[PDB]
């Protein structure tokens, strides 16, 4: 149908929108910390501790699919990448800290994200 296309036209620009969030929320990880997901042979307890591990791949391959509907279910994944880090890792840490910053400088493009989606509709 014509309804179906014009659906799947908003999707697909809705995808590239987020494209875009995703690599501006990844540049604010110069040290590549979140940018593969954590290694079960190096990590071998990990998923004792975390049980929904995310990673930019991860999220990035959901993308590439059209697998996010809105913006929400997008930020749900980033937001697992800093939670999971914070909670596996201690505060005095490289990992913590670099999990915080992301949180901070992210916060800022996110919040125009909502503005964008909600105005292009
Ligand atoms: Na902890």
């Given at each position: 149908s014509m309804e179906q296309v014009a659906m799947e036209l908003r999707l697909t620009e809705l995808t590239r929108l987020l494209r875009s969030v995703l690599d501006q929320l990844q540049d604010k990880d110069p040290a590549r910390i979140?940018?593969?997901?954590?290694s079960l042979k190096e990590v071998p307890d990990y998923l004792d501790h975390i049980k929904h591990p995310m990673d930019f791949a991860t999220m990035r391959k959901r993308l590439e699919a059209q697998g996010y509907k809105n913006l929400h279910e997008f930020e749900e994944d980033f937001d697992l990448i800093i939670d999971n880090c914070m909670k596996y890792n201690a505060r005095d840490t490289v990992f913590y800290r670099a999990a915080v910053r992301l949180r901070d400088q992210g916060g800022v493009v996110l919040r125009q994200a909502r503005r964008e989606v909600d105005s292009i509709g």
């Open positions: 979140f940018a593969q997901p954590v």
